[PDB]
């Protein structure tokens, strides 16, 4: 693989991102002054457990759709069999959503963009999963300190999806080669931007995994349905 091939894979991944990112970074940054008032917060805390889980599962569904669209536009992914695609999307898609959320997270006041405004942890009291909420906030806080650029996000989330160490893969050799090529791309682009320093600072791969799993566990506990099943409907 040549320099031109590597730079093209970079441009193709970043383009696929830019087209599927759902929320424009500029919009999210500008919306940072648009903070929920006490009464609105109280308005959310008073809502039913059932309602809050309905709202949250719906936003998650939408976000997963965009991430699935991202994946389909990564070179090679479509060329994999339906089984291997779904194997990669099963946990991978939701792991990507949780990384993407650091863009909608403001470290200065520890708030998150939710349904049009920024609000802190207390917004989600009705859900009755404070430790799950804490885990998201703390993961998003640690990622924000890295100041991910749009392209770093793009490249890093491609690697989250395209990973050969996932249960029950068939064309495992071919996913290893797709993972290899995107690793070259990510590394090349980091050196070019003198941003190699983030490599050691990236969240341990199994931290994002165990976070995703615990959230999926609790999501299904509220009688919903695994996100992979829902996504299959489209
Ligand atoms: O917009 S969300 O509802 C959101 C929740 C918490 C903080 C900010 C934003 N949504 C974000 C998404 F990007 F997916 F749209 C979201 C919904 C639900 C979750 C959950 O992790 C779970 F369990 F449903 F997967 C939880 F409900 F627990 F928070 C996480 C994020």
UniProtKB/Swiss-Prot annotation:
Factors inducing expression: Up-regulated in the state of obesity.
Tree of life domain: Eukaryota
Domain NR LBD as annotated: residue spans: 5-234
Compartments, as annotated in UniProt: Nucleus
Tissue expression summary: Isoform 1 is widely expressed in many tissues, including liver and adipose, and highly expressed in skeletal muscle. Isoform 2 is primarily expressed in immature thymocytes.
Mutation effect (residue 133 to N): Nearly abolishes transcriptional activity
Related illness: Immunodeficiency 42: An autosomal recessive primary immunodeficiency characterized by increased susceptibility to concomitant candidiasis and mycobacteriosis. Candidiasis is characterized by persistent and/or recurrent infections of the skin, nails and mucous membranes caused by organisms of the genus Candida. Mycobacteriosis is characterized by infections caused by moderately virulent mycobacterial species, such as Bacillus Calmette-Guerin (BCG) vaccine, environmental non-tuberculous mycobacteria, and by the more virulent Mycobacterium tuberculosis.
Family: Belongs to the nuclear hormone receptor family. NR1 subfamily.
Oligomeric and partner information: Interacts (via AF-2 motif) with the coactivator NCOA2 (via LXXLL motif). Interacts with the corepressor NCOR1. Interacts with CRY1. Interacts (via AF-2 motif) with the coactivators NCOA1 and PPARGC1A (via LXXLL motif). Interacts (via AF-2 motif) with PROX1. Interacts with FOXP3. Interacts with NR0B2.
Known role: Nuclear receptor that binds DNA as a monomer to ROR response elements (RORE) containing a single core motif half-site 5'-AGGTCA-3' preceded by a short A-T-rich sequence. Key regulator of cellular differentiation, immunity, peripheral circadian rhythm as well as lipid, steroid, xenobiotics and glucose metabolism. Considered to have intrinsic transcriptional activity, have some natural ligands like oxysterols that act as agonists (25-hydroxycholesterol) or inverse agonists (7-oxygenated sterols), enhancing or repressing the transcriptional activity, respectively.
Domain notes per entry: The AF-2 (activation function-2) motif is required for recruiting coregulators containing LXXLL motifs such as NCOA1 and NCOA2.
Name by which UniProt lists this protein: Nuclear receptor ROR-gamma
Whole-protein coverage range: 265 to 498 of 518
